[PDB]
Design a binder for these strands. Sequence first.
DNA 1: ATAGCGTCTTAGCATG
DNA 2: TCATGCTAAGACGCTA
Lengths: 87, 91
Amino acid sequence: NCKPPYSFSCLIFMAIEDSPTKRLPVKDIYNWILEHFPYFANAPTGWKNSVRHNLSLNKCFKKVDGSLWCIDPEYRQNLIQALKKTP
Amino acid sequence: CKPPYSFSCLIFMAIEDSPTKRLPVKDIYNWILEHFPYFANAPTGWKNSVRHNLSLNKCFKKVDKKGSLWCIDPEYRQNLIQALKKTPYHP
DNA sequence: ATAGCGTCTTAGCATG
DNA sequence: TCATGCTAAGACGCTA
Ligand SMILES: [Mg+2]
Ligand SMILES: [Mg+2]
């Protein structure tokens, strides 16, 4: 139960990159976060809301053509480096 | 890249250009978009930096009338003027 | 979606 | 040389 130094942008990024189809709906993004980080079981209930806000307004996440989310090809490398610059 | 005006200068020029010297945050977006077309297709984070500058800077006071109106604190105004006449351009 | 305030990094300058 | 502090600035994120 560590504290993840990554933002919710990097947690969503790693969950989608670990999927077989490189895409996930908002449900499995929750389940991937709880598994690899049991920290969010003791966190306040609003943690699921903050990842939807990031999923919706971040330039790095788009929907494919309960829909499915994926990584945007333009700002993809912005996320790989955002995970190398995390404190 | 970014226009040569700082976010504090962009907010100051938008409020002073209004008849009541008071604006909500949505109207500040509309003034900057029409006077600077770069932000129409810019990354969406620029609106976040606008609201961040309003809450952080002491020279921007919150006033009441759904958000709230924003104005320029009078006792911090001519300090902001001299800072903007000393460095009028900041890319 | 919006509005308020936040975290993080960077930079020049500055003091120990 | 170094560390530490100050100040403004902004890209980007969180919460209600
Ligand atoms: Mg999005
Ligand atoms: Mg203020």
